[PDB]
């Protein structure tokens, strides 16, 4: 496929993490008018180290809301998050323009994969 789970580039991994968090929020809370990409994309790409922690808090809450129901995907997203943050030593304080482009590329690559039936 197009997604490369072996890239291990910090912008790419952050984009993938953002995509999986958005998918988790979308699953946990259907019908919401705005998704994570609509709200925190600007802040996330501006200073990831300042907002990714709260994004992860919200993702944890969303996964908690999903694990209770007997249909348990929640665990799958949690393992994805373990793997993605495994390769990050620390969040970047700022991301360069090309790094932001790679961030968006990784986000879109991860998002399509999670849409597979």
């Amino acid at each position: 496929v197009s997604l490369d789970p072996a890239r291990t580039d910090r912008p790419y991994l952050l984009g993938r993490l953002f995509a999986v968090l958005e998918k988790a929020q979308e699953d946990a809370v259907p019908g919401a008018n705005a998704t994570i990409k609509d709200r925190y994309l600007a802040s996330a790409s501006a200073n990831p180290g300042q907002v990714f922690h709260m994004l992860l808090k919200n993702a944890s809450n969303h996964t908690a809301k999903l694990r209770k129901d007997p249909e348990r995907k929640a665990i799958h997203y949690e393992i994805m998050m373990q793997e993605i943050i495994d390769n990050i030593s620390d969040f970047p304080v700022t991301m360069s323009s090309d790094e932001q482009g790679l961030f968006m590329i990784g986000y879109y690559h991860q998002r399509k994969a999670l849409f597979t039936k």
Partner: protein
Amino acid sequence: MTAIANRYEFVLLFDVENGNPNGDPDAGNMPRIDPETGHGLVTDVCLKRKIRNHVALTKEGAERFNIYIQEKAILNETHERAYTACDLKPEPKKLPKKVEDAKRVTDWMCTNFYDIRTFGAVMTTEVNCGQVRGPVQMAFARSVEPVVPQEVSITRMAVTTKAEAEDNRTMGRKHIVPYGLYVAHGFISAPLAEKTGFSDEDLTLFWDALVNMFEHDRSAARGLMSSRKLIVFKHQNRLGNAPAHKLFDLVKVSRAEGSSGPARSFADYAVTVGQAPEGVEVKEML
């Protein structure tokens, strides 16, 4: 109009708590942020509008203190007023050929309207009154530390026309900056003041507007905004005797001993001002 005879530069410090200092028209309504560092931004036009509002409130449309842009007015009608007061025909899309009359119309505009006399304006329209550059200019305000805008969900227990559930029959959005201390720079030019007539009474009213800019700007989405520091540098001569960037560097902001966690009050920042150069007088009592 006895225009001011000295060049000024000032630094204004203001902060917002759980508010939206300036929304972004093309990105929902999020507070403006630097797209690379996350520092908050407040456009100069916002502060100028707040000053205009304060002047209108405190003068109540007195003589020579009208406001040009005002609120949902038709500017071409104001230009027609100016032409009529000068006994000229505004039919052409161009300025009057006689330079004296072309100056007279713009002088009338500057004399009558305070914001034209202060910030200038462009009046090149179907009925033309020329251009004014504006003695007073101020750049973008920029927060001293990165801000994290927050989107707050809000509901309503009423419906406008009809809902599909007749359940969250209404869900809204509120954007707030938990805290941010903004720094705004500004310049006042003596030659332009001499061209437009910006006098000393206008300068005093402008200082008052800066100090009490936010006291009557309260709103549901503004939160609590306040003016904290206003340092004014006054030069001893018309053209000034010190670079602007040197003066602004004298005002320094730092966290002091409240480094624990994010900043959430003006007490988390310390402001110090150094000694001005030989020819510059710094007054901070404002």
